């Protein structure tokens, strides 16, 4: 499975990005670190497109697709 | 966070334009212009001065995205922030907005308090 790792999030961003990714897809194993958000990713959107929208709040390299 | 940022409230509907206006008000924003469409806006934009397109997704002659792609294949307007105002938070809109190059999105009607938060993040990402 591809895991999306959103590294480096802000105060209230955890809650909010949690809230935003929550608009595009569904996050599980929501590790709400003080500043991070990892969650496993479904694969429901072309890597090339998830990239594109998170990209409304965050950037291409903050995004890693690992297994 | 310029309480004077020039909002091209592109929408073809007056009262909304008016509460958007009044909420911008109770929140402190008072500089709002109104446009009725994409050719009008493109014509209007072919002019310039616009900083924030609070563009409603839909309008006649040329809509929000053609507005946005033409905006993008054209040398001069290729990078304007377009806050697509959407009546609802939907993915493809959100993505097409993304692949053709849009800046962000918001859902009406919002309280003064909510409009307050969305503006903040675009501002954030674009570096404003």
Swiss-Prot record, chain A:
It comes from the Bacteria. It is found in: Cytoplasm. Involved in the transmission of sensory signals from the chemoreceptors to the flagellar motors. CheA is autophosphorylated; it can transfer its phosphate group to either CheB or CheY. An in vitro complex of CheW/CheA(L)/CheA(S) in a 1:1:1 ratio increases the autophosphorylation of CheA and is required for the binding of CheY, the phosphorylation substrate. This complex accounts for 10% of the total number of molecules. May have three functional domains: one for interaction with CheB and CheY, a second for regulating phosphorylation and controlling the stability of the protein, and a third for receiving input signals regulating CheA activity. This is Chemotaxis protein CheA. It comes from Escherichia coli (strain K12). The chain holds residues 159 to 225 of 654 of the full protein.
Swiss-Prot record, chain B:
The modification 4-aspartylphosphate is found at residue 56. The keyword Cytoplasm applies. Keywords: Acetylation, Chemotaxis, Cytoplasm, Flagellar rotation, Magnesium, Metal-binding, Phosphoprotein, Two-component regulatory system. Residues 6-123 form the Response regulatory domain. Pfam families: Response_reg. NCBIfam families: PRK10610.1. InterPro entries: CheY-like_superfamily, Sig_transdc_resp-reg_receiver, ST_Response_Regulator. It is found in: Cytoplasm. This is Chemotaxis protein CheY. Involved in the transmission of sensory signals from the chemoreceptors to the flagellar motors. In its active (phosphorylated or acetylated) form, CheY exhibits enhanced binding to a switch component, FliM, at the flagellar motor which induces a change from counterclockwise to clockwise flagellar rotation. Mg(2+) binds at residues 11-12, 56, 58. Its cofactor is Mg(2+). The gene is cheY. Phosphorylated by CheA or acetylated by acetyl-CoA synthetase, depending on which acetate metabolism pathway is available. It comes from the Bacteria. One of its GO terms (cellular component) is cytoplasm. Its main location: cytoplasm. GO terms for biological process: archaeal or bacterial-type flagellum-dependent cell motility; chemotaxis; phosphorelay signal transduction system. GO terms for molecular function: metal ion binding. Binds 1 Mg(2+) ion per subunit.
């Amino acid at each position: 499975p591809r895991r999306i790792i959103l590294s480096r999030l802000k105060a209230g961003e955890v809650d909010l990005l949690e809230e935003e990714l929550g608009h595009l897809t569904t996050l599980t194993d929501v590790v709400k670190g003080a500043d991070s958000l990892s969650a496993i990713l479904p694969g429901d959107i072309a890597e090339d497109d998830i990239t594109a929208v998170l990209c409304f709040v965050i950037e291409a390299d903050q995004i890693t697709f690992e297994t | 966070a310029d309480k004077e940022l020039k909002f091209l409230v592109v929408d073809d509907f007056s009262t909304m334009r008016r509460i958007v206006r009044n909420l911008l008000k109770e929140l402190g924003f008072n500089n709002v212009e109104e446009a009725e469409d994409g050719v009008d806006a493109l014509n209007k934009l072919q002019a310039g001065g616009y900083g924030f397109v609070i563009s409603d997704w839909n309008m006649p002659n040329m809509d929000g995205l053609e507005l946005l792609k033409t905006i993008r294949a054209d040398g001069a307007m290729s990078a304007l922030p377009v806050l697509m105002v959407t009546a609802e938070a939907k993915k493809e809109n959100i993505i097409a907005a993304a692949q053709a190059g849009a800046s962000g999105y918001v859902v009406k009607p919002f309280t003064a308090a909510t409009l307050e938060e969305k503006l903040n993040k675009i501002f954030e990402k674009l570096g404003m």
